[PDB]
């Protein structure tokens, strides 16, 4: 995988441990640490022609920002879990 | 507000990187500044603040679409608005 892929993969389990446990400030810290690095990757790898899987992950991210802004923590947690599970699998397709 | 202060610090870091031509760092710092703005806004939320919040929303949507022309345009605009917000 590209070096940015290896970098992203390293943080994914920890985001899900935090989210599952309802450590929502930790989930947000870890996501925000990831934000520039997922976007750099997504631009280089997916661009304006993302696969439906990659695009669903990135739409999840957009919708996480919107939920968090609205304080809708139920949606922050649900979207974070679903988006994480898809990202983990996206980064395994070469497996 | 230490969030305000981090933002101010990051704005300066951006101007230092841009003076050196460290453009990957500029773009990275601009992206660090997105969640940090939202945290600030969600802690203090002015019309200008609201325009900055929308600028980040729109940058994100443009990036998700691959409209890097719009990412570039909106980022430039939003950066200036933040500088102005913290210059009052
Ligand atoms: C996970 C969530 C949903 O299940 O509603 C979702 C919908 C559309 C795009 C991304 C995520
Ligand atoms: Cl984030
Ligand atoms: Cl956003
Ligand atoms: Cl963004
Ligand atoms: Mg590791
Ligand atoms: Mg798997
Ligand atoms: Zn984000
Ligand atoms: Zn995104
Ligand atoms: Zn945002
Ligand atoms: Zn961003």
PDB file of C-alpha atoms and ligand atoms in Angstrom:
ATOM      1  CA  UNK A   1       0.000   0.000   0.000  1.00  0.00           C
ATOM      2  CA  UNK A   2       1.202   3.619  -0.436  1.00  0.00           C
ATOM      3  CA  UNK A   3       2.940   5.233   2.491  1.00  0.00           C
ATOM      4  CA  UNK A   4      -0.180   7.347   3.160  1.00  0.00           C
ATOM      5  CA  UNK A   5      -2.235   4.186   3.230  1.00  0.00           C
ATOM      6  CA  UNK A   6       0.095   2.613   5.768  1.00  0.00           C
ATOM      7  CA  UNK A   7      -0.162   5.792   7.837  1.00  0.00           C
ATOM      8  CA  UNK A   8      -3.958   5.787   7.795  1.00  0.00           C
ATOM      9  CA  UNK A   9      -4.274   2.117   8.577  1.00  0.00           C
ATOM     10  CA  UNK A  10      -2.309   2.547  11.763  1.00  0.00           C
ATOM     11  CA  UNK A  11      -4.961   4.680  13.498  1.00  0.00           C
ATOM     12  CA  UNK A  12      -8.158   2.833  12.485  1.00  0.00           C
ATOM     13  CA  UNK A  13      -8.434   0.305  15.259  1.00  0.00           C
ATOM     14  CA  UNK A  14      -8.029   2.965  17.852  1.00  0.00           C
ATOM     15  CA  UNK A  15     -10.831   5.073  16.469  1.00  0.00           C
ATOM     16  CA  UNK A  16     -13.135   2.126  16.678  1.00  0.00           C
ATOM     17  CA  UNK A  17     -12.130   1.212  20.201  1.00  0.00           C
ATOM     18  CA  UNK A  18     -12.896   4.748  21.267  1.00  0.00           C
ATOM     19  CA  UNK A  19     -16.216   4.936  19.441  1.00  0.00           C
ATOM     20  CA  UNK A  20     -17.428   1.555  20.713  1.00  0.00           C
ATOM     21  CA  UNK A  21     -16.607   2.620  24.243  1.00  0.00           C
ATOM     22  CA  UNK A  22     -18.330   5.976  23.835  1.00  0.00           C
ATOM     23  CA  UNK A  23     -15.151   7.941  24.351  1.00  0.00           C
ATOM     24  CA  UNK A  24     -16.438  10.611  22.034  1.00  0.00           C
ATOM     25  CA  UNK A  25     -13.856  13.307  22.705  1.00  0.00           C
ATOM     26  CA  UNK A  26     -11.130  10.743  21.897  1.00  0.00           C
ATOM     27  CA  UNK A  27     -12.960   9.708  18.737  1.00  0.00           C
ATOM     28  CA  UNK A  28     -12.997  13.359  17.672  1.00  0.00           C
ATOM     29  CA  UNK A  29      -9.354  13.879  18.504  1.00  0.00           C
ATOM     30  CA  UNK A  30      -8.317  10.853  16.512  1.00  0.00           C
ATOM     31  CA  UNK A  31     -10.540  11.717  13.563  1.00  0.00           C
ATOM     32  CA  UNK A  32      -9.243  15.267  13.491  1.00  0.00           C
ATOM     33  CA  UNK A  33      -5.645  13.982  13.544  1.00  0.00           C
ATOM     34  CA  UNK A  34      -6.587  11.795  10.556  1.00  0.00           C
ATOM     35  CA  UNK A  35      -8.481  14.488   8.605  1.00  0.00           C
ATOM     36  CA  UNK A  36      -5.596  16.003   6.593  1.00  0.00           C
ATOM     37  CA  UNK A  37      -3.994  12.604   5.934  1.00  0.00           C
ATOM     38  CA  UNK A  38      -7.207  10.939   4.721  1.00  0.00           C
ATOM     39  CA  UNK A  39      -7.869  13.909   2.474  1.00  0.00           C
ATOM     40  CA  UNK A  40      -4.368  13.917   1.002  1.00  0.00           C
ATOM     41  CA  UNK A  41      -4.749  10.241   0.301  1.00  0.00           C
ATOM     42  CA  UNK A  42      -8.264  10.558  -1.087  1.00  0.00           C
ATOM     43  CA  UNK A  43      -7.245  13.328  -3.466  1.00  0.00           C
ATOM     44  CA  UNK A  44      -4.288  11.400  -4.831  1.00  0.00           C
ATOM     45  CA  UNK A  45      -6.019   8.008  -5.037  1.00  0.00           C
ATOM     46  CA  UNK A  46      -9.677   8.753  -5.771  1.00  0.00           C
ATOM     47  CA  UNK A  47      -9.918  12.413  -6.844  1.00  0.00           C
ATOM     48  CA  UNK A  48     -13.034  13.142  -8.883  1.00  0.00           C
ATOM     49  CA  UNK A  49     -13.428   9.468  -9.828  1.00  0.00           C
ATOM     50  CA  UNK A  50     -13.764   7.664  -6.544  1.00  0.00           C
ATOM     51  CA  UNK A  51     -15.053   4.142  -6.369  1.00  0.00           C
ATOM     52  CA  UNK A  52     -18.479   3.790  -4.732  1.00  0.00           C
ATOM     53  CA  UNK A  53     -16.710   2.374  -1.620  1.00  0.00           C
ATOM     54  CA  UNK A  54     -14.192   5.190  -1.327  1.00  0.00           C
ATOM     55  CA  UNK A  55     -16.841   7.751  -2.061  1.00  0.00           C
ATOM     56  CA  UNK A  56     -19.158   6.317   0.620  1.00  0.00           C
ATOM     57  CA  UNK A  57     -16.348   6.588   3.140  1.00  0.00           C
ATOM     58  CA  UNK A  58     -15.685  10.213   2.210  1.00  0.00           C
ATOM     59  CA  UNK A  59     -19.404  11.065   2.244  1.00  0.00           C
ATOM     60  CA  UNK A  60     -19.534   9.525   5.700  1.00  0.00           C
ATOM     61  CA  UNK A  61     -16.766  11.902   6.711  1.00  0.00           C
ATOM     62  CA  UNK A  62     -18.643  14.905   5.328  1.00  0.00           C
ATOM     63  CA  UNK A  63     -21.741  13.796   7.220  1.00  0.00           C
ATOM     64  CA  UNK A  64     -19.707  13.286  10.425  1.00  0.00           C
ATOM     65  CA  UNK A  65     -18.644  16.881  10.245  1.00  0.00           C
ATOM     66  CA  UNK A  66     -22.263  17.921   9.805  1.00  0.00           C
ATOM     67  CA  UNK A  67     -23.497  15.744  12.688  1.00  0.00           C
ATOM     68  CA  UNK A  68     -20.763  16.967  14.980  1.00  0.00           C
ATOM     69  CA  UNK A  69     -21.625  20.574  14.099  1.00  0.00           C
ATOM     70  CA  UNK A  70     -25.233  19.946  14.917  1.00  0.00           C
ATOM     71  CA  UNK A  71     -24.327  18.110  18.136  1.00  0.00           C
ATOM     72  CA  UNK A  72     -26.119  15.037  16.894  1.00  0.00           C
ATOM     73  CA  UNK A  73     -24.030  12.539  18.755  1.00  0.00           C
ATOM     74  CA  UNK A  74     -26.149   9.522  17.929  1.00  0.00           C
ATOM     75  CA  UNK A  75     -25.366  10.185  14.243  1.00  0.00           C
ATOM     76  CA  UNK A  76     -21.761  10.945  15.014  1.00  0.00           C
ATOM     77  CA  UNK A  77     -21.410   7.537  16.603  1.00  0.00           C
ATOM     78  CA  UNK A  78     -23.375   5.617  13.945  1.00  0.00           C
ATOM     79  CA  UNK A  79     -21.665   7.286  11.017  1.00  0.00           C
ATOM     80  CA  UNK A  80     -18.271   6.926  12.676  1.00  0.00           C
ATOM     81  CA  UNK A  81     -18.759   3.172  13.164  1.00  0.00           C
ATOM     82  CA  UNK A  82     -20.083   2.536   9.650  1.00  0.00           C
ATOM     83  CA  UNK A  83     -17.422   4.739   8.009  1.00  0.00           C
ATOM     84  CA  UNK A  84     -14.658   3.105   9.977  1.00  0.00           C
ATOM     85  CA  UNK A  85     -15.766  -0.362   9.052  1.00  0.00           C
ATOM     86  CA  UNK A  86     -15.804   0.547   5.369  1.00  0.00           C
ATOM     87  CA  UNK A  87     -12.436   2.265   5.557  1.00  0.00           C
ATOM     88  CA  UNK A  88     -10.855  -0.771   7.178  1.00  0.00           C
ATOM     89  CA  UNK A  89     -12.162  -2.955   4.384  1.00  0.00           C
ATOM     90  CA  UNK A  90     -11.166  -0.447   1.669  1.00  0.00           C
ATOM     91  CA  UNK A  91      -7.615  -0.612   2.900  1.00  0.00           C
ATOM     92  CA  UNK A  92      -7.674  -4.495   2.755  1.00  0.00           C
ATOM     93  CA  UNK A  93      -8.729  -4.917  -0.873  1.00  0.00           C
ATOM     94  CA  UNK A  94      -5.158  -5.683  -1.853  1.00  0.00           C
ATOM     95  CA  UNK A  95      -5.048  -8.222   0.944  1.00  0.00           C
TER      96      UNK A  95
ATOM     97  CA  UNK B   1      -9.689  30.901  24.491  1.00  0.00           C
ATOM     98  CA  UNK B   2      -6.791  28.649  23.924  1.00  0.00           C
ATOM     99  CA  UNK B   3      -8.626  27.429  20.814  1.00  0.00           C
ATOM    100  CA  UNK B   4      -8.534  31.006  19.436  1.00  0.00           C
ATOM    101  CA  UNK B   5      -4.869  31.150  20.246  1.00  0.00           C
ATOM    102  CA  UNK B   6      -4.088  27.872  18.522  1.00  0.00           C
ATOM    103  CA  UNK B   7      -5.873  29.198  15.492  1.00  0.00           C
ATOM    104  CA  UNK B   8      -3.862  32.347  15.589  1.00  0.00           C
ATOM    105  CA  UNK B   9      -0.656  30.386  15.961  1.00  0.00           C
ATOM    106  CA  UNK B  10      -1.597  28.172  12.983  1.00  0.00           C
ATOM    107  CA  UNK B  11      -2.365  31.207  10.836  1.00  0.00           C
ATOM    108  CA  UNK B  12       1.130  32.434  11.526  1.00  0.00           C
ATOM    109  CA  UNK B  13       2.586  29.010  10.777  1.00  0.00           C
ATOM    110  CA  UNK B  14       0.841  29.115   7.427  1.00  0.00           C
ATOM    111  CA  UNK B  15       2.392  32.497   6.552  1.00  0.00           C
ATOM    112  CA  UNK B  16       5.841  31.183   7.546  1.00  0.00           C
ATOM    113  CA  UNK B  17       5.473  28.056   5.374  1.00  0.00           C
ATOM    114  CA  UNK B  18       4.179  30.101   2.469  1.00  0.00           C
ATOM    115  CA  UNK B  19       7.123  32.505   2.769  1.00  0.00           C
ATOM    116  CA  UNK B  20       9.482  29.503   2.507  1.00  0.00           C
ATOM    117  CA  UNK B  21       7.576  27.888  -0.313  1.00  0.00           C
ATOM    118  CA  UNK B  22       6.767  24.874   1.870  1.00  0.00           C
ATOM    119  CA  UNK B  23       3.411  24.411   0.077  1.00  0.00           C
ATOM    120  CA  UNK B  24       2.666  20.839   1.206  1.00  0.00           C
ATOM    121  CA  UNK B  25       2.974  22.195   4.771  1.00  0.00           C
ATOM    122  CA  UNK B  26       0.732  25.126   3.907  1.00  0.00           C
ATOM    123  CA  UNK B  27      -1.955  22.803   2.641  1.00  0.00           C
ATOM    124  CA  UNK B  28      -1.561  20.525   5.674  1.00  0.00           C
ATOM    125  CA  UNK B  29      -1.784  23.406   8.162  1.00  0.00           C
ATOM    126  CA  UNK B  30      -4.848  24.750   6.361  1.00  0.00           C
ATOM    127  CA  UNK B  31      -6.411  21.323   6.899  1.00  0.00           C
ATOM    128  CA  UNK B  32      -5.444  21.281  10.565  1.00  0.00           C
ATOM    129  CA  UNK B  33      -7.175  24.547  10.804  1.00  0.00           C
ATOM    130  CA  UNK B  34     -10.543  23.109   9.624  1.00  0.00           C
ATOM    131  CA  UNK B  35     -11.421  20.947  12.638  1.00  0.00           C
ATOM    132  CA  UNK B  36      -9.848  23.514  14.935  1.00  0.00           C
ATOM    133  CA  UNK B  37     -12.150  26.210  13.543  1.00  0.00           C
ATOM    134  CA  UNK B  38     -15.181  24.005  14.016  1.00  0.00           C
ATOM    135  CA  UNK B  39     -14.223  23.350  17.657  1.00  0.00           C
ATOM    136  CA  UNK B  40     -13.818  27.078  18.191  1.00  0.00           C
ATOM    137  CA  UNK B  41     -17.096  27.929  16.533  1.00  0.00           C
ATOM    138  CA  UNK B  42     -19.000  25.194  18.431  1.00  0.00           C
ATOM    139  CA  UNK B  43     -17.516  26.818  21.651  1.00  0.00           C
ATOM    140  CA  UNK B  44     -18.410  30.480  20.871  1.00  0.00           C
ATOM    141  CA  UNK B  45     -21.254  30.431  18.337  1.00  0.00           C
ATOM    142  CA  UNK B  46     -21.203  36.832  14.422  1.00  0.00           C
ATOM    143  CA  UNK B  47     -22.003  36.818  10.718  1.00  0.00           C
ATOM    144  CA  UNK B  48     -18.295  36.566   9.863  1.00  0.00           C
ATOM    145  CA  UNK B  49     -17.894  33.489  12.082  1.00  0.00           C
ATOM    146  CA  UNK B  50     -20.813  31.885  10.368  1.00  0.00           C
ATOM    147  CA  UNK B  51     -19.305  32.662   6.943  1.00  0.00           C
ATOM    148  CA  UNK B  52     -16.047  30.967   8.015  1.00  0.00           C
ATOM    149  CA  UNK B  53     -17.983  27.932   9.221  1.00  0.00           C
ATOM    150  CA  UNK B  54     -19.723  27.738   5.870  1.00  0.00           C
ATOM    151  CA  UNK B  55     -16.476  28.149   3.996  1.00  0.00           C
ATOM    152  CA  UNK B  56     -15.146  24.969   5.695  1.00  0.00           C
ATOM    153  CA  UNK B  57     -18.396  23.110   4.912  1.00  0.00           C
ATOM    154  CA  UNK B  58     -18.054  24.076   1.271  1.00  0.00           C
ATOM    155  CA  UNK B  59     -14.314  23.241   1.087  1.00  0.00           C
ATOM    156  CA  UNK B  60     -15.140  19.789   2.398  1.00  0.00           C
ATOM    157  CA  UNK B  61     -17.953  19.217  -0.081  1.00  0.00           C
ATOM    158  CA  UNK B  62     -15.740  20.388  -2.936  1.00  0.00           C
ATOM    159  CA  UNK B  63     -12.948  18.048  -1.870  1.00  0.00           C
ATOM    160  CA  UNK B  64     -15.310  15.090  -1.639  1.00  0.00           C
ATOM    161  CA  UNK B  65     -16.361  15.841  -5.223  1.00  0.00           C
ATOM    162  CA  UNK B  66     -12.808  16.329  -6.502  1.00  0.00           C
ATOM    163  CA  UNK B  67     -13.428  19.999  -7.365  1.00  0.00           C
ATOM    164  CA  UNK B  68      -9.938  21.104  -6.495  1.00  0.00           C
ATOM    165  CA  UNK B  69     -10.494  24.412  -8.258  1.00  0.00           C
ATOM    166  CA  UNK B  70     -13.163  25.147  -5.690  1.00  0.00           C
ATOM    167  CA  UNK B  71     -11.042  23.733  -2.828  1.00  0.00           C
ATOM    168  CA  UNK B  72      -8.330  26.190  -3.884  1.00  0.00           C
ATOM    169  CA  UNK B  73     -10.725  29.149  -4.258  1.00  0.00           C
ATOM    170  CA  UNK B  74     -12.692  28.545  -1.074  1.00  0.00           C
ATOM    171  CA  UNK B  75      -9.597  27.795   0.969  1.00  0.00           C
ATOM    172  CA  UNK B  76      -8.040  31.085  -0.074  1.00  0.00           C
ATOM    173  CA  UNK B  77     -11.210  32.966   0.758  1.00  0.00           C
ATOM    174  CA  UNK B  78     -11.750  31.198   4.079  1.00  0.00           C
ATOM    175  CA  UNK B  79      -8.164  31.730   5.166  1.00  0.00           C
ATOM    176  CA  UNK B  80      -8.500  35.461   4.548  1.00  0.00           C
ATOM    177  CA  UNK B  81     -11.775  35.600   6.418  1.00  0.00           C
ATOM    178  CA  UNK B  82     -10.135  33.954   9.421  1.00  0.00           C
ATOM    179  CA  UNK B  83      -7.225  36.341   9.362  1.00  0.00           C
ATOM    180  CA  UNK B  84      -9.748  39.210   9.336  1.00  0.00           C
ATOM    181  CA  UNK B  85     -11.804  37.628  12.112  1.00  0.00           C
ATOM    182  CA  UNK B  86      -8.800  37.481  14.347  1.00  0.00           C
ATOM    183  CA  UNK B  87      -7.581  41.043  13.234  1.00  0.00           C
ATOM    184  CA  UNK B  88     -10.660  42.863  14.586  1.00  0.00           C
TER     185      UNK B  88
HETATM  186  C1  LIG C   1     -23.596   5.187   7.241  1.00  0.00           C
HETATM  187  C2  LIG C   1     -24.668   6.146   6.716  1.00  0.00           C
HETATM  188  C3  LIG C   1     -26.057   5.549   6.795  1.00  0.00           C
HETATM  189  O1  LIG C   1     -26.166   4.294   7.006  1.00  0.00           O
HETATM  190  O2  LIG C   1     -27.101   6.228   6.668  1.00  0.00           O
HETATM  191  C4  LIG C   1     -24.251   6.731   5.519  1.00  0.00           C
HETATM  192  C5  LIG C   1     -25.106   7.064   4.471  1.00  0.00           C
HETATM  193  C6  LIG C   1     -24.686   7.629   3.295  1.00  0.00           C
HETATM  194  C7  LIG C   1     -23.324   7.909   3.146  1.00  0.00           C
HETATM  195  C8  LIG C   1     -22.437   7.604   4.172  1.00  0.00           C
HETATM  196  C9  LIG C   1     -22.890   7.018   5.333  1.00  0.00           C
HETATM  197 CL1  LIG C   2     -12.300  14.902  11.418  1.00  0.00          CL
HETATM  198 CL1  LIG C   3     -17.378  20.237   6.877  1.00  0.00          CL
HETATM  199 CL1  LIG C   4     -11.948  19.583   3.896  1.00  0.00          CL
HETATM  200 MG1  LIG C   5       0.096   0.438  14.706  1.00  0.00          MG
HETATM  201 MG1  LIG C   6     -11.639  -6.943   6.606  1.00  0.00          MG
HETATM  202 ZN1  LIG C   7     -12.718  15.562   9.346  1.00  0.00          ZN
HETATM  203 ZN1  LIG C   8     -13.654  14.286   4.027  1.00  0.00          ZN
HETATM  204 ZN1  LIG C   9     -15.844  20.473   8.453  1.00  0.00          ZN
HETATM  205 ZN1  LIG C  10     -10.731  19.799   5.798  1.00  0.00          ZN
END
